[PDB]
Amino acid sequence: KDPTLLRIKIVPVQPFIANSRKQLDLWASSHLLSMLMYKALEVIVDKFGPEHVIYPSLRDQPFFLKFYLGENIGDEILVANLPNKALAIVSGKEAEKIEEEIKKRIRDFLLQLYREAVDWAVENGVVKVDRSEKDSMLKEAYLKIVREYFTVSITWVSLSEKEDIYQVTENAGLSDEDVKKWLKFAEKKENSRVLERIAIYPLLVKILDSLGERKVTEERFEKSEQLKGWKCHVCGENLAIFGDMYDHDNLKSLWLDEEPLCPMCLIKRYYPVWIRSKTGQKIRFESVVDVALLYKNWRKIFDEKYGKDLVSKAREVSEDFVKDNMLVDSDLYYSSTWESGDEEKVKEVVDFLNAAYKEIGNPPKYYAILVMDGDDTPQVHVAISQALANFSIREVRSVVKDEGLLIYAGGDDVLAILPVDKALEVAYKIRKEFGKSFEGWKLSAGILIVHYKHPLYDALEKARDLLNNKAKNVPGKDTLAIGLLKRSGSYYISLVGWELIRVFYNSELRKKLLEEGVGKRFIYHVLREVDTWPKVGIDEMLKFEVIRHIRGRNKEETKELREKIYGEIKDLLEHVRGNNEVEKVRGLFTFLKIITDAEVFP
Amino acid sequence: MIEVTFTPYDIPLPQTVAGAIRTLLFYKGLKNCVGVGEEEPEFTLVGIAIGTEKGRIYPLPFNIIKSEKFYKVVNPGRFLGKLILPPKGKYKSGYVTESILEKYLKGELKEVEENKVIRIEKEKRITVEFLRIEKIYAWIEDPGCGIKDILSSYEFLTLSRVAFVEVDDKTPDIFNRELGSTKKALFYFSTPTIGKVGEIVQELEKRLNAKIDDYLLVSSRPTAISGWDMHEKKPKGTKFAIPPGSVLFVEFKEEVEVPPYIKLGKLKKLGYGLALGGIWE
Ligand SMILES: Nc1ncnc2c1ncn2[C@@H]1O[C@H](CO)[C@@H](OP(=O)(O)O)[C@H]1O
Ligand SMILES: [Zn+2]
């Protein structure tokens, strides 16, 4: 009818996602957020179809195919592909009512999962509470928290309305060097300054965004007071259910694993079963240890020479540690777990694993968190939405495969948990595909390598930091910030260009290190030569250290080797971020220090 | 107004300061202000600020975005009658010195150099994380509890860590500024301010007895405010505050004389709601 541009924004995102103890909560949060966008986009598709939703492109969106068209689709449904922002065109007369419908649908949807969640929690002993006092679980205090947690912000603008090109953009504060010219070329294409807004669509989107941000900070601070009482063990913010009726000890004795959950985190624990009973699907790897154990198929090699025995000696300790001839807790593959979480029947399990470690190698204890983000008419905008929709649904999914857990892929952004020996390769390919998708378009990323016991909220925060304050802070961006957070607390960071990965993989330096404590002292001496500017100069120092630690089998072979390692180092130096040569040498060697760490890459 | 400077050595920081003083009066008999079994004390903690070797520092205002080697100050734009903030990049956090904050409040700051933005050094401990802070400043309005004379008899107080105490009886320059009159004023929240945007604004109106045609809140994500409830033996109910660094842009109907500072929201007595006056063009 009367053309109107409408933007949708859902928050909070990262704070919600970060509030997770298990990888399953992380996935659930991400997935649920995507479901919220879906519940919001359906309100517009019901009234105008997928042709009026410019971004994201619903066309091939699994959620759209399975929940809207009802088709039967596979595990690809488990990946969150809908971002938290969207653009559509609606009847200007419909706008205001649509803003009310969308808020109500999301609000009703959550209250529903909550009610389903509470029944599930009781019927499955997540919370051991009287049949009677189960009703207090749906009192107002808890409904408030569920109802007010997310903030769906919708703002729109009339496309038909006419305004003075320059006067509108200047007043919105968009008069850049670019915008100034762009507009001109638009006044050239038409003998006029007073046009219909849809004539400056691009700049319209940005104004709409600003309008959107104004809307969110007015809506997100309206939260209601909360009853005094013990807080949720997962997020620490909201009241834990029953947290106002019991003392701290009595409260925790009422929950599975003694961890009191608030309404949101309860929905969080319940979301996986919901999605499973509604699609018959569930994530292949439930914990970070499952992903960690993919390193060099360690897990698969263990289940083919010690699987049966381990499960057997497990029951001997307790029938609980098993379920379907499998281990209940994936972390039971580690010695330490048994010496912590019939004393004598355990000494066996430990020693069994200890020996096994000597035959196939110690079990991987580190995993990787990969986060990626794009660096930096309407119908053409739609074409873009589709290239991105297709890149995130098919290409990203394509390169990850089953070597890790792809949690989110909403276009030019990615979140994934991967074993350490697949992180660099996966990240690189994703970036490569992204480039091909546009025959340019740069992508930045953060990879954090962390121990399986590290609190998930903190790891997620460091991964974001690596992305936003390291990688994206590099001039020209298009950088990968690699961070290694060791259990001892030591944290090594390195900023590199995407090509360093390729150059390093096919290098002699790489082979030479994977077969040397020679490489360790080479890395130490060089780093020690770059704490400050080396008097003899970067180049000469590198040759000196190369001659010092590199050797072949005979005078001629070692001559060739030193010459190649040095050359590869200079090449690699081409792809390390830094304000000068000493910073680059440091960065490259910190990177090397990271990939040659024996504990992380056993 | 008295200014107390705490030098630490091995609930939010504001309440910690507030409570540290309440406990001191308690054991020192002067319970006439401790406010036994009450949320707020008798005296009012106007606010708290932190410091390093460089002196007092403040959270970088949320409308100052990093853009290459500079932190550009972004002022309000306008669209169809609404005050808006033009899109110009993500907000990167950090702190700023009082000197810099003053230029910003006067509207004289266009951009701040990269090496001028401070990043507070963290410190892990066993797990817990703390900020390598050197000084904590506290401004208190004592209706007659004789807090100044009591503190001046102590060099050390408990914040369970300990801190050296210094009590200067003189309001800081930041609170004595002369901003002038204008219709385009701003309010920088130096401490978490508890309340609904709309409520804060009303209060702001009925306080400067003026009318507000439009306002824009540049903030980030709510600060969750906890606290212990002694008589209840439980944790206080969570409240969500507008985080320090947030800027309330205001456009008055008729010119107003911008106060150098003003308190808003709940828990004023505990240090919350300290807003500093500013101006924009
Ligand atoms: N459902 C989700 N799950 C994981 N990440 C998501 C997500 N939805 C959006 N994102 C990502 O969260 C970033 C910070 O808010 C967003 O970037 P924007 O700044 O919103 O573009 C998304 O990349
Ligand atoms: Zn929670």
PDB file of C-alpha atoms and ligand atoms in Angstrom, chain A residues 19 232-238 261-266, ligand 2:
ATOM      1  CA  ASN A  19      25.443 -16.361  30.284  1.00  0.00           C
ATOM      2  CA  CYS A 232      20.817 -17.646  39.386  1.00  0.00           C
ATOM      3  CA  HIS A 233      24.039 -19.642  39.408  1.00  0.00           C
ATOM      4  CA  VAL A 234      24.433 -19.387  35.651  1.00  0.00           C
ATOM      5  CA  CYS A 235      23.958 -15.615  35.098  1.00  0.00           C
ATOM      6  CA  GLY A 236      24.216 -14.133  38.619  1.00  0.00           C
ATOM      7  CA  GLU A 237      21.762 -11.362  37.705  1.00  0.00           C
ATOM      8  CA  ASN A 238      18.159 -12.520  37.984  1.00  0.00           C
ATOM      9  CA  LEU A 261      18.302 -21.371  37.759  1.00  0.00           C
ATOM     10  CA  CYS A 262      16.449 -18.130  36.988  1.00  0.00           C
ATOM     11  CA  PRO A 263      13.528 -18.083  34.507  1.00  0.00           C
ATOM     12  CA  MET A 264      15.691 -17.272  31.464  1.00  0.00           C
ATOM     13  CA  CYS A 265      18.362 -19.855  32.156  1.00  0.00           C
ATOM     14  CA  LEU A 266      15.661 -22.463  32.805  1.00  0.00           C
TER      15      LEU A 266
HETATM   16 ZN    ZN C   2      19.938 -16.942  34.936  1.00  0.00          ZN
END
